Amino acid sequence: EDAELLVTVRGGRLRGIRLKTPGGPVSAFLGIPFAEPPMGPRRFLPPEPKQPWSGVVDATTFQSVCYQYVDTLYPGFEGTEMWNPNRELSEDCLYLNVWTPYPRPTSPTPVLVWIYGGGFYSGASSLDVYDGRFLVQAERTVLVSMNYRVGAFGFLALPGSREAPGNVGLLDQRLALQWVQENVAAFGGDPTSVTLFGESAGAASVGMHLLSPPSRGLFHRAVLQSGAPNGPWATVGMGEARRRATQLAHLVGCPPGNDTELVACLRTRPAQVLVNHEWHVLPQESVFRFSFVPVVDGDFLSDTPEALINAGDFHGLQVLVGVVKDEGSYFLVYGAPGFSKDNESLISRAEFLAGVRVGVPQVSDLAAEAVVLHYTDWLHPEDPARLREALSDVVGDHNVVCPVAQLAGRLAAQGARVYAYVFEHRASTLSWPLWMGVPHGYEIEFIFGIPLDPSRNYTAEEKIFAQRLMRYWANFARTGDPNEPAPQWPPYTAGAQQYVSLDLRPLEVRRGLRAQACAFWNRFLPKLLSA
Amino acid sequence: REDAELLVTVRGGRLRGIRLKTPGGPVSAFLGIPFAEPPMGPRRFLPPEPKQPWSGVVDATTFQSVCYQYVDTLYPGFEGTEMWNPNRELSEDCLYLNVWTPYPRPTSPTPVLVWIYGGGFYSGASSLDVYDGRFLVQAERTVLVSMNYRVGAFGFLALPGSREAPGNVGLLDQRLALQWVQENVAAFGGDPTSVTLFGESAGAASVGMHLLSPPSRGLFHRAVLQSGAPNGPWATVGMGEARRRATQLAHLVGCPPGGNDTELVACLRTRPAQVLVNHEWHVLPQESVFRFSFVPVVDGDFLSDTPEALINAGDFHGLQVLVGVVKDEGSYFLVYGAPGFSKDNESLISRAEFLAGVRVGVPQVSDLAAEAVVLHYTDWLHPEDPARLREALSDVVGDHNVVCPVAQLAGRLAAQGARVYAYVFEHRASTLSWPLWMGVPHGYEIEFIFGIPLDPSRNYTAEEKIFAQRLMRYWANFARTGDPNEPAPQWPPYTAGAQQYVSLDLRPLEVRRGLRAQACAFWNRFLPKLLSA
Ligand SMILES: *[C@@H]1O[C@H](CO[C@@H]2O[C@@H](C)[C@@H](O)[C@@H](O)[C@@H]2O)[C@@H](O[C@@H]2O[C@H](CO)[C@@H](O)[C@H](O)[C@H]2NC(C)=O)[C@H](O)[C@H]1NC(C)=O
Ligand SMILES: *[C@@H]1O[C@H](CO[C@@H]2O[C@@H](C)[C@@H](O)[C@@H](O)[C@@H]2O)[C@@H](O[C@@H]2O[C@H](CO)[C@@H](O)[C@H](O)[C@H]2NC(C)=O)[C@H](O)[C@H]1NC(C)=O
Ligand SMILES: NC(=O)c1cc[n+](COC[n+]2ccccc2/C=N/O)cc1
Ligand SMILES: NC(=O)c1cc[n+](COC[n+]2ccccc2/C=N/O)cc1
Ligand SMILES: *[C@@H]1O[C@H](CO)[C@@H](O)[C@H](O)[C@H]1NC(C)=O
Ligand SMILES: *[C@@H]1O[C@H](CO)[C@@H](O)[C@H](O)[C@H]1NC(C)=O
Ligand SMILES: *[C@@H]1O[C@H](CO)[C@@H](O)[C@H](O)[C@H]1NC(C)=O
């Protein structure tokens, strides 16, 4: 029997599996339990470390996906099904995965830790696009990814209560990071060189461990793709979190009042029941808003991410951040009037103004008017093509680009070394319509080297392009610098605001992550709402 | 003996004019015709009364006195400022008008242009060399009229509701002159059924107020508004603020030693005119540029409502309007207060000076409103570039005070039945004395519209003389027909959708879209909603 696939961690013995790659084999240990199953009385509770086991845990297959909604907008469509659960749903879902070179490294290898996105309501470490076999073979790193609770199971909060303190999905992530510190050396990984990287809610999640001291000692570098902890969707206040949690209880037949009896009744309901009602607790119609997200309650986050970002000292931190070219387009088909993947989505002026209230929810009429002013071309006020692109910019700037730009500028101006990118290559295999451009999430398959899979239809230059990106990411993980020692990728600074475009052409350096648009979102609009 | 062409009988009595030499030929001029009783002593602050008939012949042979007004002293002896200063003695006895007509007098009736000078409602005179009407009349065979009207406190001090200082008497001076034109211009060969008002800055704002005041609307048929509009934030003032200023002015000159409005103005009538001028600026509520102490007051009589409300609710079918701006409306005003600005250096301001300049250029807005201005006019990839900041502040002052008010007016009139033509004047005169960074400053299209480059004593280029002749032909092309186009690039009308205008310079006409559309959307659509909330 292959001794390379047998590992002893602190909890007991594991049996892995060898995987094939166009470049040779890698070792994979999938479905490693890192917590006790958060079932029954453990629902809504912080995770507890997995108790030691006898015998050999079978770590040859992905474990269950945490209970979550399944997208039904375009049934059977590749563009949406690639994000849906590809394993059975269960609350018994707190498992993690380790990929390492074959044979296992004998000297400490830098570790990449992947945190998936999905708006804190969905996601799984087992999706094909997160397959960690190509990056590990090509770049000789250890790759870890974990499952964490999403939706109500991960982020329902009755602030102050002990039965539902909130943020337990983030504590799932932290527990996995502690697991990496204690056990990754058994796989050949270096616990003193851990780089977190995540996308969308995963990137926001990464932002959060940076701003939470108990997590800060568990990693060394960070990569935030198309997400930030200061996004208007990534956190919720204590009052709004309580209201959302109490309405969910009402919608599923639970009282009132008292917090203890409410959580007890919620613990009696099948997981699928909470999933089916979780979306009817949002205060208004919206895109890019999610019911149960991290709560700012003074514990995991002692203050708002913005407050912590502005006050933090980030000397000694290296971060890689970036966005895709069209962050907003993907979200518009989930509620913006007139949008659909199956026509040109050439909306009218009335639909554009309607879409602004959906894309910028819960703001005063004056704030909405301000948005319409900045994103209108008053020489072509009614052109459908520009209106379609304008609303995509509104959603993309408000939710992704400008939060990321704000984060990058504050970190750089306060001690961090920041590298910024814009991913501008539209994959030849992309199934979404052409008007969506380079949509949210479609840089991930290149970061993980999925184009190297010969079973897929990517072009030759797209394979080289994926190899470039894997090299950038792994360089950063190894040294805090993506550059290969062209042209050079310069650091992002608050003044010069330099970033690079990532596509098939060599690196091009540009200035300003939508500087004009983001001055509105990050400088003016906050002052208007507070007055 | 006498020349019959220079003798004219008008309702008040008989007049004797003079015969002007121009390069192209002779012109008959009747300069200094009294149209009102002198507004002096007990008649100060009061509406004008028509000039009583006279026996004998009144010699209308030279410009009469300039209405009492402040004299600019920022750059003493400087050509660029002295050209606007009084060129006749100051006096309260100043209600006189001027008539230019071809020589010989027209056989058939001739359309009439009526000039209203600008000067922020505190200054100006029809006698300025750059308002010389002899060239337009000789070149285009038009009849041209201009009148003096009271400015400053003498024309616009208002204690609303009172009988002695009802306000807007300077506008009533203009209206009285317009009524004089209707009754008497035919004696000069002028057509009272074809009268086109034209004016610049406060004169353009005056023109617009006559459009919006029904008693004036029947006195003319077309309008030209150059670098000004009645809806500009400087052109009117509320009844309470007008009262506050009038009361503070009186307080600063010893009146009363508020209370009864009569005793207050009666005390004001005893003050020397210069004493009122010397204290007139101390009543402005803040340090600012482009705001003037005594301006028309929105009091329900001359203006039944605010100019914006009247513009929005007006029906303008049967009306032709010609509006426009210069290329750099804001630069001229920045040297009168904006920190870091001077005509003698490049005025490359710092960002701190830019932020300070915003409060001076956009006075009395909330801190939130000021930051909205800073957001829209800052290049966030070059936030501290001095040259960009200088240009930005110039745009900040021009759009807010001139360009966007004109655009709002042009758009509303076009959509509500009027035919609009719009221009941007983009030629910098070869003789301009202001520095290069000011570009094409406020007020420097006037000399080309009046054909001043044809003056033999001035060293304009031959190309600029052709340009002046073309511009003189466009307005006349409008006063005659309502259309600046000829009986040849064509000049299209301005509409709220396409928003087309033409550039006026040495090149042929070029059609462009949008009078700073993105910027004026902020001033005309958004910021009013913020000041309300
Ligand atoms: C493009 O489609 C949207 C959505 O319509 C759906 O998708 C279409 C491709 C087709 O499959 C329809 O049967 C689907 O309903 C259109 O927006 C809708 O328009 C209808 C009226 O036709 C209206 O009742 C719905 O409320 C609209 N829904 C949304 C989300 O806007 C849109 O008009 C289409 N635009 C075109 C034809 O270019
Ligand atoms: C440019 O000049 C302005 C105004 O100063 C005037 O013009 C100068 C050329 C010179 O003739 C001065 O004597 C004039 O007073 C400068 O701004 C002023 O600077 C002075 C001295 O620091 C200060 O006392 C005033 O308050 C300033 N006034 C303003 C309008 O801000 C400006 O600093 C000069 N910039 C240059 C040329 O670098
Ligand atoms: N639990 C639910 O019913 C539910 C319903 C809808 N969504 C939103 O999924 C649609 N969606 C899918 C992908 C990306 C964005 C979006 C919408 N964002 O607002 C989540 C959960
Ligand atoms: N009465 C006065 O002392 C007085 C002072 C200054 N001004 C204005 O003269 C300065 N100025 C002259 C020309 C153009 C603009 C400006 C300033 N605008 O705010 C008028 C009256
Ligand atoms: C993409 O791959 C699929 C495999 O199922 C194949 O059927 C299809 O023909 C490929 N597309 C192209 C354009 O070759
Ligand atoms: C002001 O006082 C005069 C007497 O000097 C008086 O005739 C007049 O009635 C008073 N004002 C008003 C508005 O009555
Ligand atoms: C220019 O004009 C001035 C006065 O306007 C005059 O004195 C002078 O003779 C003219 N020509 C030159 C070369 O200065």
The full 3-state SS of B103-156, as one line of letters, equals: CCCCCCCEEEEEEECCCCCCCCCCCCHHHCCHHHHHHHCCEEEEECCCCCHHHH
Separation of first and last alpha carbons in chain B = 73
**Residue in B502, B511, B435 with CA at minimum distance from that of residue B474:** B502
Amino acid (one-letter) located at B23: P
CB-based contact A319:A411 (threshold 8 Å) = yes
Count Cα atoms within 13 angstroms, Cβ side, for A59: 27
* All structural domains of chain A: 1-531 (3.40.50.1820)
**Residue in B437, B440, B270 with CA at minimum distance from that of residue B338:** B437
CB contact under 8 A, A519 and B378: yes
The C-alpha atoms of residue A372 and residue A374 are separated, in whole angstroms, by: 6
The C-alpha atoms of residue B264 and residue A294 are separated, in whole angstroms, by: 68
Nearest residue (CA) to ligand 4, atom 11: B336
The C-alpha atoms of residue A6 and residue A4 are separated, in whole angstroms, by: 6
The C-alpha atoms of residue B392 and residue B383 are separated, in whole angstroms, by: 11
Residue A334, ligand 3, Cβ within 6 A: yes
**Residue in A92, A91, A66, A69 with CA at minimum distance from that of residue A80:** A69
Give chain A's count of helices (H) and strands (E).
19, 16
Binding site feature residues of B for huperzine A: 84, 131, 332
CB-based contact B131:B116 (threshold 8 Å) = no
| Ligand 4 surroundings by CB, under 6 angstroms | B 70, 72, 122, 277, 280-281, 289-291, 333, 336
The C-alpha atoms of residue B202 and residue B214 are separated, in whole angstroms, by: 20
DSSP per residue, B210-268:
HHHSHHHHTT-SEEEEES--TTSTTT-EEHHHHHHHHHHHHHHTT------HHHHHHHH
CB contact under 8 A, A524 and B381: no
The C-alpha atoms of residue A437 and residue A427 are separated, in whole angstroms, by: 10
The C-alpha atoms of residue A518 and residue A409 are separated, in whole angstroms, by: 11
B/e letters for A370-402, b = 16+ CB within 10 Å, e = fewer, are bbbbbbbbbeeeeebebbbbbbbbbbbbbbbbb
Q: What angle do CA A382, A386, A390 make, to 5 degrees?
A: 105
CB contact under 8 A, B375 and A519: yes
Q: Which atom of ligand 1 is nearest to the CA of A336?
A: 30
CB contact under 8 A, A528 and B525: no
The C-alpha atoms of residue B86 and residue A503 are separated, in whole angstroms, by: 68
Mutate to test the pocket of ligand 4, among B293, B333, B394 (most ligand atoms within 8 A of CB): B333
Beta bridge partners of B199: B116, B225
Strands B7-10 and B13-16: antiparallel
Per the listing, tokens 């969905």 go with: A122
**Residue in B80, B78, B85 with CA at minimum distance from that of residue B434:** B80
Say yes or no: A494 contacts chain B, CB-CB below 8 A: no
The question of whether A291 is a catalytic residue gets the answer no
- For A382, which residue in chain B has the nearest alpha carbon? B497
Say yes or no: A302 contacts chain B, CB-CB below 8 A: no
CB-based contact A135:A448 (threshold 8 Å) = yes
Roughly what angle, to the nearest 10 degrees, separates helices A349-359 and A365-374? 120
Roughly what angle, to the nearest 10 degrees, separates helices A384-396 and A349-359? 10
Say yes or no: B530 contacts chain A, CB-CB below 8 A: yes
Roughly what angle, to the nearest 10 degrees, separates helices B169-184 and B202-212? 70
The C-alpha atoms of residue A44 and residue A263 are separated, in whole angstroms, by: 8
CB-based contact B108:B143 (threshold 8 Å) = no
**Residue in B218, B202, B190 with CA at minimum distance from that of residue B30:** B190
The C-alpha atoms of residue A112 and residue A110 are separated, in whole angstroms, by: 7
DSSP per residue, A306-331:
HHHHHH---TT-EEEEEEETBTTHHH
DSSP per residue, A461-511:
HHHHHHHHHHHHHHHHHHHS---------PPB-TTT-EEEEESSSPPEEEE
The C-alpha atoms of residue A118 and residue A82 are separated, in whole angstroms, by: 12
Strands laid side by side in the A26-33 sheet: A17-19, A26-33, A95-101, A142-146, A109-115, A189-199, A221-225, A318-324, A417-423, A498-502, A508-511
The C-alpha atoms of residue A38 and residue A49 are separated, in whole angstroms, by: 11
The C-alpha atoms of residue A115 and residue A209 are separated, in whole angstroms, by: 11
Secondary structure (3-state) at B157? coil
- Start-end of H helices in B362-461: 367-377, 386-398, 404-415, 446-449
CB contact under 8 A, A516 and B380: yes
Strands (E), A256-361: 318-324
Mutate to test the pocket of ligand 4, among B151, B280, B284, B288 (most ligand atoms within 8 A of CB): B280
Amino acid (one-letter) located at A93: C
CB-based contact B480:B195 (threshold 8 Å) = no
**Residue in A284, A292, A288, A381 with CA at minimum distance from that of residue A332:** A288
Strands (E), B3-91: 7-10, 13-16, 18-22, 25-34, 57-59, 66-67, 90-91
The C-alpha atoms of residue A433 and residue B436 are separated, in whole angstroms, by: 52
Per the listing, tokens 């000004």 go with: B228
Q: Check A327, A389, A424, A445 and give the catalytic one.
A: A327
- For B532, which residue in chain A has the nearest alpha carbon? A366
Secondary structure (3-state) at B190? strand
**Residue in B119, B82, B81, B112 with CA at minimum distance from that of residue B97:** B112
* CA A282 remoteness from chain centre: 21
B/e letters for A261-280, b = 16+ CB within 10 Å, e = fewer, are ebbeebbebebeebbebbee
The C-alpha atoms of residue B394 and residue A478 are separated, in whole angstroms, by: 51
Q: Is A143 exposed, middle or buried (0-12, 13-18, 19+ CB in 10 A)?
A: buried
The question of whether B442 is a catalytic residue gets the answer yes
CB-based contact B398:B328 (threshold 8 Å) = yes
CA B228 – ligand 4 centroid, Å: 17
The C-alpha atoms of residue B51 and residue A9 are separated, in whole angstroms, by: 110
CA A15 – ligand 6 centroid, Å: 108
**Residue in B175, B151, B120 with CA at minimum distance from that of residue B45:** B151
**Residue in A216, A267, A238, A94 with CA at minimum distance from that of residue A165:** A238
- For A377, which residue in chain B has the nearest alpha carbon? B518
DSSP per residue, B292-329:
-SS--EE-SSSSSS-HHHHHHH---TT-EEEEEEES-T
CB-based contact B198:B224 (threshold 8 Å) = yes
Q: Is the peptide bond before B104 cis (omega within 30 degrees of 0)?
A: yes
The C-alpha atoms of residue A417 and residue A409 are separated, in whole angstroms, by: 10
Give residues with Cβ within 8 angstroms of A418, minimum separation 6.
Answer: A318, A319, A320, A321, A408, A411, A412, A491, A492, A493
Roughly what angle, to the nearest 10 degrees, separates helices B386-398 and B351-361? 10
- Start-end of H helices in B455-526: 462-479, 517-521
Question: How many residue contacts between A and B have a Cβ separation below 8 Å?
Answer: 48
CA A516 – ligand 1 centroid, Å: 33
**Residue in B385, B395, B317, B384 with CA at minimum distance from that of residue B362:** B395
The C-alpha atoms of residue B4 and residue B356 are separated, in whole angstroms, by: 62
DSSP per residue, A381-401:
TT-HHHHHHHHHHHHHIIIII
Per the listing, tokens 């070219």 go with: A325
Q: How was this structure determined?
A: X-ray
The question of whether A327 is a catalytic residue gets the answer yes
The C-alpha atoms of residue B82 and residue A114 are separated, in whole angstroms, by: 74
CB-based contact B283:B182 (threshold 8 Å) = no
Per the listing, tokens 């040109």 go with: A344
**Rounded to whole angstroms, what are the CA distances from A280 to A276, B243, B301, B451, B490?**
9, 58, 58, 73, 61
The C-alpha atoms of residue A211 and residue A207 are separated, in whole angstroms, by: 7
Tally of CB atoms within 10 A around A234:
24
Q: Is A313 exposed, middle or buried (0-12, 13-18, 19+ CB in 10 A)?
A: exposed
**Rounded to whole angstroms, what are the CA distances from B95 to A414, B176, B466?**
68, 10, 35
Q: What's the residue count for chain B?
A: 533
DSSP tag of B186 = G
